[PDB]
């Protein structure tokens, strides 16, 4: 049971690390008012541009 | 040729020790013990048995008294009392009405009829063990007996066997020993004053030849009733056969590891109680030279079936392609199992019997200097409870070999490839700044 | 009534034990040590003898051979030999030049005298003290030998008496000692099998009457040269004897704490280590009636002259008032002195002798429930060496005695008054702030 709580955390862990990879990839286009944002489109739902 | 080893201290339990010796065919010793009594050491504090109250004849005075000249005797009590009239078969006795005296004593020995049936309180101190052992190897197989720990390495056969150092000598025994006719108990026995009477150990002596028991037995007298004659006494019961009935619980009984207990002398006999280590001066002619053992070359092993059984469990076939016919011997380099027998006479085909513990016989094989791997899964047996002890000691219960964990050789994945290239892709633009 | 005491292990030394048992007549009383026998239990394993080299007449013959049997014996050496041709008293004894065959056997047997002295090789251990002392309270000067581990304890004039157990539990042994006729030697021995010869223990048996023994002689015997008839034979010389005469260390020389080494059976005597427990019952019947109790008023005391001896050199005379006398006791309130009788008679004034180790004792008194002080000067004495040991067990050198100690009561220091100053000079600087 204990395998299975390790397989739960890490497992966790590695979703913090994707999502804040993804965080720090995506906020520096918070500002700077036109929002044209490429093909990476497959993350960061459309906001009005 | 010096070499040792390390064997488990239990009954039956058939063990292998194998030699890689240079320039000869290798060799296998097989060795079991069946008498392991650990003899102790024992001392003396005292003895105990019952007792006999020897009451003397009455004596009476017809107005005239005496007193109680002693007697070096033990519990020599004695008294005098007046106010007598004692009556007998003629009737009256005297002519002196109040004036008349009685006189009487007691003394009490340690009864006759106990020389044979008696108790012994024992202190005890540290035990050594007794193995006796078969030594079960090429040439026919001899029988050894030797004290575990006095070193004293007895020889077969051209051959010079030390044993032990037995190890924390842990003993079935606490340190106030009491022994019966065929038994023995763990007490306190109270230490050579009898502070309560009517308990165990109330009369004692020195051995059975001591002059002079001690008796704490707590007699008075009393004074005679009216009339007739007679010696009264009121002291307590006999101690002894008091004590006899409230043993009810032997070390036969809660002796730990088994251990069989017997008397004259005490011993205790064929306990599980830990290991032996051994070494061996061994002799350098009882080998075979390997010019003449042949050396069987272009093997590879099998198996037949597997089971989780006590006797003789999994059954393996080999294959071996002989070049001179002779004989050697076999050896498994691991604990994972032990094997029925030592030798084949090694013509082609060979049948091994083995025994695995709980999952997985990984197993290296040797015949004459030649390895061999061998796996098998296992089928668990389906019985219950058994009459005979195991066989396959080695208790082992992990693996990896294609069944055991593989779902986590697939499990453990996934992680360090998202987050080492998810920080690579990262730095595209926290490189550049 | 009971109580609990403490006494040095040695012998001279007396021992006083002084109650304090409120509402009657104190008391003390007086033990003194004149034995104490330490013996460990043995345990043997082999002995040994000179062995006789014994050998029967030689098998000859000519005009054809023979063998050999080699039958269950101590080292049984035979062999043949090819041309043997010889001499004899006249003439010769064949003609078969090329076929005259001898044979030659020999053995070993334990020689006539191995029955009257060996090596007892004792595995000894766990030693355990006895003693003999002498107690001597009010109206008793009786004697009694008692065990010193915890249980053994009886009795002495209707009073109850227990000693021990020991306070360290130490041998002046080993564990793997030998004997002989009458000494004892601290050293090895060979582990019944490895007797290499020449050495001590070339050969063993477990008793007197072990049927077969161990022997490594290295016994071999060779050809005679022509013309006489006997047997050559070699081995190493019967290595008891060599043993004999390099012993170079008894233990009755080198033992420890002077505890002298005695046999049959093998303890040691008068070890001057550690001190003893000890616990008595004492009945009432020793005590007498404070009424009936010499009664003193005004107890003061003086001294005469002090010798800083071994012997009881003290004298103290001691002024003490009067009004109904009796036989009164005395006591010492320290571990400082010691005093000489138990007891005085009382009798206007009294004289003690008194003993110390220190020059400035100051042992209060104690007489019949009035304690008052005296101290004293003293003085080293003229003589350098002794014949008799110490009676004064409390040697215990720094007493304050306010004579040398005074020196450092002047050393006092009011300069700690001067930091004061300082302290406050440091204020009336701050106060104006
Ligand atoms: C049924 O059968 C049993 C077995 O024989 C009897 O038990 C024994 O009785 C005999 C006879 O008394 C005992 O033998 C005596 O033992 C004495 C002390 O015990 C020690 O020695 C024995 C070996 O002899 C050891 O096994 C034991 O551990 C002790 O070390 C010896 O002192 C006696 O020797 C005699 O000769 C010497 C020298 O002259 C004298 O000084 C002695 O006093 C004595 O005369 C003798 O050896 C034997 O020990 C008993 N065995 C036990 C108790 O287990 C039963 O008695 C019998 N049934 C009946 C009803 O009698
Ligand atoms: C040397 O090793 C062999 C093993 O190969 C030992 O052998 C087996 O020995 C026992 C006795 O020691 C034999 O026992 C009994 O035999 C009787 C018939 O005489 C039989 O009725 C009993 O049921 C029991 O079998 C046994 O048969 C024999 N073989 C097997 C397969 O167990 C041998 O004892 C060892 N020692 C010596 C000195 O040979
Ligand atoms: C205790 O009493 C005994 C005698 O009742 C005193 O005697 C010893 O007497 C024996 C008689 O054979 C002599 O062999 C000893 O040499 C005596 N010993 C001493 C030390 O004198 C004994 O002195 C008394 N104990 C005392 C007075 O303390």
Redesign the pocket.
């Known amino acids: 049971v204990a395998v299975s709580v390790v397989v739960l955390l890490s497992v966790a862990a590695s979703v913090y690390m994707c999502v804040v990879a993804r965080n720090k990839c995506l906020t520096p286009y918070a500002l700077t008012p036109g929002a044209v944002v490429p093909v990476t489109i497959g993350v960061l739902c459309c906001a009005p541009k | 040729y010096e070499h040792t080893a390390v064997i488990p201290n239990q009954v039956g339990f058939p063990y292998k020790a194998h030699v890689a010796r240079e320039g000869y065919s290798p060799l296998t010793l097989q060795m079991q013990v069946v008498e392991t009594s650990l003899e102790p050491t024992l001392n003396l504090e005292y003895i105990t048995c019952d007792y006999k109250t020897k009451v003397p004849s009455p004596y009476v005075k017809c107005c005239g008294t005496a007193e109680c000249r002693t007697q070096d005797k033990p519990e020599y009590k004695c008294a005098v009392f007046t106010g007598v009239y004692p009556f007998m078969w003629g009737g009256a006795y005297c002519f002196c009405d109040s004036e008349n005296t009685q006189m009487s004593e007691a003394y009490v020995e340690r009864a006759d009829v106990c020389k044979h049936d008696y108790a012994a309180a024992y202190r005890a101190h540290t035990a050594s063990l007794r193995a006796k052992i ?1 030594v ?1 190897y090429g040439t ?4 050894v007996e030797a004290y575990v720990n006095g070193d004293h390495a007895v020889t077969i056969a051209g051959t010079k066997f030390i044993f032990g150092p037995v190890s924390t000598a842990w003993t079935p025994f606490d340190t106030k020993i009491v022994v019966y006719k065929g038994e023995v108990y763990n007490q306190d026995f109270p230490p050579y004053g009898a502070g309560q009477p009517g308990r165990f150990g109330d009369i004692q002596s020195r051995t059975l030849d001591s002059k002079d028991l001690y008796a704490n037995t707590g007699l008075k007298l009393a004074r005679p009733a009216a009339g007739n004659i007679h010696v009264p006494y009121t002291q307590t019961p006999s101690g002894f056969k008091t004590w006899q009935k409230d043993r009810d619980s032997p070390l036969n009984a809660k002796a730990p590891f088994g251990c069989t207990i017997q008397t004259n002398p005490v011993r205790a006999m064929n306990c599980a109680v830990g290991n032996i280590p051994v070494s061996m001066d061994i002799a350098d002619s009882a080998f075979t030279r390997l010019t003449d053992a042949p050396i069987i070359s272009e093997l590879l092993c099998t198996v037949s079936t597997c089971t989780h059984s006590s006797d003789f469990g999994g059954v393996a076939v080999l294959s071996y392609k002989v070049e001179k016919a002779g004989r050697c011997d076999v050896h498994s380099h691991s604990n994972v199992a032990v094997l029925q027998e030592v030798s084949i006479e090694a013509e082609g085909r060979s049948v091994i019997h083995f025994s695995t513990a709980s999952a997985a016989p990984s197993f290296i094989v040797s015949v004459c200097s030649s390895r061999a791997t061998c796996t098998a899964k296992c089928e668990p047996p389906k019985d219950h409870v058994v009459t005979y002890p195991a066989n396959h000691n080695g208790i082992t219960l992990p693996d990896l070999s294609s069944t055991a964990m593989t779902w986590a050789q697939h499990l453990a994945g996934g992680v360090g490839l998202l987050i080492a290239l998810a920080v690579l892709i990262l730095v595209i633009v926290t490189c550049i700044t």
């Open positions: 078969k079960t026919v197989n001899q029988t």
